Assembly symmetry: D2
Homo-oligomer: 267 residues x 4
């Protein structure tokens, strides 16, 4: 296929449609999160979804049942540990052999950091870099070969506003550094796969996935004052961007980054 061409559909609803297409999402281990929302969004567009999980399948199992019943499409859960290449490589092979192909890939690897560079050990640093950065690298290289053989494809990497600025007052340089590298990874791969696939990243700000309770009320109040919209976001506010990049509504966008932080980076 001589390079990537523009959508054949003049209709937005046909550009966004994922019918006849296969999309795979990483996290989606719980009925509440960025990965499950991306899964629901793509599914709503008639997409056959393939969500993965790290340790326990319970969460994925149900997400699939909920995905097939409410959207009436085909779905399946797979075990995948991004920190391991062979794991990712296995994911692709198994998803391709099951669904027959992979059209879009949503990668959301986000292991947090609990300290600064000095207070933290080396192990602490490597954990974040190995999962957040290298983990993204693993998924990309896994689907990359499949995209090259089909001459089509869309890789959406989930980065973070932490890849733009440094969070305060919590210190998490390792996370920021990993996420920043993730953003540029999108740019560089877009240029590398310029002949067959599109690559773009989403940089979420403070999105409440359901764990706010494990955070000091004062800390949250301190964050909201820094967020011009003065509130946390909800994962369902990302599905749009997720579907946008995965579908044919962005056949000319590649190497881009979309900020969704309620205007945080703006200040």
């Amino acid at each position: 296929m001589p390079g990537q061409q523009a959508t054949k559909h003049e209709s937005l609803l046909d550009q966004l449609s994922l019918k006849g297409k296969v999309v795979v999402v990483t996290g989606a281990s719980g009925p509440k999160g960025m990965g499950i929302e991306a899964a629901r969004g793509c599914a709503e567009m008639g997409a056959a979804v393939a969500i993965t999980y790290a340790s326990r399948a319970q969460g994925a199992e149900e997400n699939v049942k909920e995905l097939e019943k409410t959207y009436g499409i085909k779905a399946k859960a797979y075990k995948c540990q991004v920190d391991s290449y062979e794991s990712c490589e296995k994911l692709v092979k198994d998803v391709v052999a099951d669904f027959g192909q992979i059209d879009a890939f949503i990668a959301n690897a986000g292991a947090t950091a609990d300290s600064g560079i000095l207070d933290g050990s080396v192990e602490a640093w490597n954990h974040v870099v190995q999962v957040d950065l290298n983990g993204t690298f693993h998924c990309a290289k896994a689907v990359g070969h499949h995209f090259k053989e089909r001459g089509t494809g869309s890789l959406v990497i989930t980065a973070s506003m932490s890849g733009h600025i440094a969070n305060f007052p919590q210190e998490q340089t390792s996370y920021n550094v990993a996420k920043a590298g993730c953003i540029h990874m999108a740019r560089s791969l877009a240029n590398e796969w310029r002949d067959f696939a599109r690559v773009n990243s989403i940089s979420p700000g403070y999105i409440d996935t359901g764990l706010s309770d494990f955070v000091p009320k004062e800390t949250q109040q301190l964050w909201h004052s820094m967020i011009p919209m003065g509130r946390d976001g909800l994962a369902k506010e990302l599905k749009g961007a997720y579907v946008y990049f995965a579908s044919d509504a962005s056949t000319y966008t590649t190497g881009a980054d979309l900020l969704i932080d309620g205007g945080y980076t703006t200040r």
Copy 2:
């Protein structure tokens, strides 16, 4: 307080739906320009569109008919010269009087340059900055007052990759400077309107709007070889991004920028 809240919808389709909402597009007036595509994408989502033209009206009148028969929505053409604040103030006052209110405004100040600031005159500069920068300011300020009075709103300014980088073959700093100011104006206003409205921008690259012949067939050759995707972009590949920022599919994203240059700003 309250102010700037998340979508009430979980369904992506519902978040994208513009039924019941009024969106105005300034560019729209040509056959395949960025403006008519935005109105097309918005109209397809069930929105009542108000498009504007600068001089001749034959084009926007025809577009209004097109929009009404292919999407069954109400639309009307208005004469507006972004360079004049009164024209924009009248534009807003008129649409609201004809449609009830404005839910989303898409600015599209498109005036190009033809030289550097040295070869060009002071007039040449004032032209670009007045139409592309101040003009966008006029539209923004004009609808902002409405948005504030209502307590809601979404402003989508059409910037350009030229606000990120400087096109090589041809010199056009005045245009580039104007567009960059446009990009930050979106982040700056997202923060000023953080209590009632969102503001975001799109930075298009080389999009073929139907003026291929008015550009040296030899200058384009260079472009085609400098764009990773190796081809011009199509206005129909921008409707997705326009609808995204105009609809409720992005209630937590404000002050962000979306590049659509086929990977050009990647190298």
Copy 3:
């Protein structure tokens, strides 16, 4: 085409030297402002300096005197209205007449904004843009013609961190937008003038030039908490960067921006 070559000096001290060279600074009008500090530094490196003033002859004249007796170099003040292209074209003409040339030009003209685009009038907006954006453009175009004729030059425009983010809580979009245009103006001109001159920008964060009394004590504290260094900057903390860009100590750096904001933009 003369083309831009690397400094012929190996020694840093020699690269920083500005002996046998002429420099012009537009701010130098007060005791401890960014302008006068920019001049003192250049004069220290042994350079003839031309400073300008908007209408404060007394102050500038005092600056000229102190500059000579302390640096043993030639100095002279001129009246310049950056908002007027003729004023700038004149400034250059005069300087080239008295000093015989201009090797480096430091653009500095701050026209603070007193409100957001909604509270301010179109006039207010136009003034800030005319002085801050178009003003810088006027100095660039004025001196550019001279650099092109000499095949050598170095422009250093003083932007602001405000061109990167939006100050809080004070609203000043007109000021931020202008400064934003100033930053990309440096990038665009660096390319436009590539064959004969360098262009770069400095983005000052909160610097105290002796006017802190105009800002409420309560607002000063809010700012300091937002500055990781937790303090205001001093004009003398920018002279190194000004001299850095004005001298041969940066003959390969063009189209770059240097933030001196105590880390304010980091968050």
Copy 4:
């Protein structure tokens, strides 16, 4: 923890003076490399210098000798492999024992890639990221603990324009991604160390250090055409920036990045 205060000096020369200060450069071990240039510049300002090497002990030994003889300062070489934290931790230890302190640390990791993600193996990726990314982390973490104890310091990390864009001819995503992380590491640490030290980065473009023969001639012309200055930079054009960040001529700069690429990123 005396807080980072403004330089006490008013003179730029005093500010730039590193007499009584110790600096350490990791690259320095060759004739005209970026590292040795950084050493030379600091040596010329009157600083005690310590350079490291990974294997070329001979070259380092001679640089020391040459350093002490022309500048009359104390210099010594140390073996240090940045990919090992223990080696870095030991570097800081020994230097602080021999020199008594460390005021400025210039980090540098030159490991390069020779293929993209798909062609390269997981090992090739890991190697670059470990040396380039984690290596810079190692250095930072090592000196950081010392800076904190002294309540003063300045870290300068050598990144690359590859952290901002993706090189066209060659495919080197691992390098690009790694360099990108370095840039943000500087921002992040600037904030984390906001109480005792300053952190900043330099992003070089095509800088010919000598190996301008191992590259095909036709390849050189292609790059040179993408560089506004149309030439490769020389290592001696970076000593200005290295000394700028390491000295008291930038006591308010932190979290800033400086591009020195002949305007390459401008386009």
